[PDB]
Amino acid sequence: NEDWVVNEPMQSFEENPEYAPLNTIPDWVSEKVTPKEYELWRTMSSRYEINYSFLKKDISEKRKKEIYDCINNICERIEKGQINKYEGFLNIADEDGTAEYKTNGCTLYTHSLGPYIKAAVTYKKSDDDVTITSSSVYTGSPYLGNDPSFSGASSVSYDKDKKLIAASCSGTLSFKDGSRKVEVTVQKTGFMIP
């Protein structure tokens, strides 16, 4: 069992279930935003597979400005022909802070049998810039017995145009499915609104 996964749109809802498939928005979302806002998300969903978990929490006005200023800028580039292709996944970090000191994370891949590759990032956000202090890629499973293992490369950087953090991996996920060894080459990218 050798297999290859790349940075392309999902085939079913089930592949990375925490994220909305392209050109869809979970129904519940439409009750948490204005038509103006909803319309930006519609544009955004044409290029990103989006996790809306952040709307399940009280967001300050300072934060709403951040999130929408960001999305607005990205939509302009989508509209201008500039972000013309599938990008990857998108998460919106919480307001939880500590210039502020934050962690955010990102599920880059989830095998149907359960094992996953996740990215975590620690950074400092200020008026002007975002700076990465730490970055991790890790693996695991909801089921005991997989012993997943990831070998290969990953990267993290802040895109100053899109104003997003990009975390990528390119490597091999190995795990046990009982007596069967599974190896999957995984190349994925997830974006984060800092």
Side-chain angles (χ1 to χ4, degrees), residues 3-13 15-126 128-179 182-194:
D3 194 50
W4 273 75
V5 165
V6 303
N7 203 51
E8 72 190 344
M10 58 192 95
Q11 304 293 344
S12 88
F13 283 64
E15 307 192 354
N16 206 7
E18 75 186 58
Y19 296 92
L22 282 196
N23 305 294
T24 84
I25 308 187
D27 187 48
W28 71 267
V29 167
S30 69
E31 268 173 317
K32 294 277 210 161
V33 300
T34 74
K36 304 258 213 200
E37 290 162 357
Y38 191 90
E39 223 58 39
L40 293 176
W41 292 118
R42 183 201 312 287
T43 292
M44 213 68 189
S45 81
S46 75
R47 299 286 185 279
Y48 297 86
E49 287 170 322
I50 306 175
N51 176 330
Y52 292 99
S53 79
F54 78 104
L55 289 168
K56 305 220 214 65
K57 205 171 284 164
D58 305 335
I59 315 98
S60 87
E61 297 309 313
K62 189 212 71 166
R63 182 58 180 173
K64 279 198 220 312
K65 192 177 203 316
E66 280 169 14
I67 301 186
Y68 290 109
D69 275 358
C70 177
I71 285 305
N72 193 69
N73 158 71
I74 295 160
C75 283
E76 178 145 5
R77 296 149 176 281
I78 298 179
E79 281 165 29
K80 281 175 176 174
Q82 183 179 147
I83 298 161
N84 65 339
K85 285 176 273 294
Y86 174 73
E87 281 277 277
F89 304 110
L90 185 65
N91 288 334
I92 318 297
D94 286 309
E95 213 171 348
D96 58 54
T98 275
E100 16 165 11
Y101 264 110
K102 316 213 284 168
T103 312
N104 189 220
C106 189
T107 296
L108 290 178
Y109 168 78
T110 304
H111 192 282
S112 55
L113 294 167
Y116 59 69
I117 299 167
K118 290 185 183 204
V121 177
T122 292
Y123 57 101
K124 219 188 63 151
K125 181 180 160 280
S126 68
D128 27 284
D129 204 11
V130 169
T131 63
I132 309 299
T133 66
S134 136
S135 165
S136 310
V137 174
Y138 59 101
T139 189
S141 171
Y143 319 115
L144 307 176
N146 291 144
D147 284 8
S149 204
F150 180 79
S151 153
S154 60
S155 57
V156 183
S157 78
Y158 175 66
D159 181 321
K160 294 173 161 178
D161 303 320
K162 306 189 191 156
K163 304 170 201 326
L164 297 175
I165 296 170
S168 289
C169 74
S170 181
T172 297
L173 174 66
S174 296
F175 65 91
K176 295 289 279 165
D177 178 21
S179 61
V182 178
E183 292 197 356
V184 187
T185 296
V186 178
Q187 296 175 279
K188 297 236 133 181
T189 297
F191 292 88
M192 291 171 276
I193 297 193

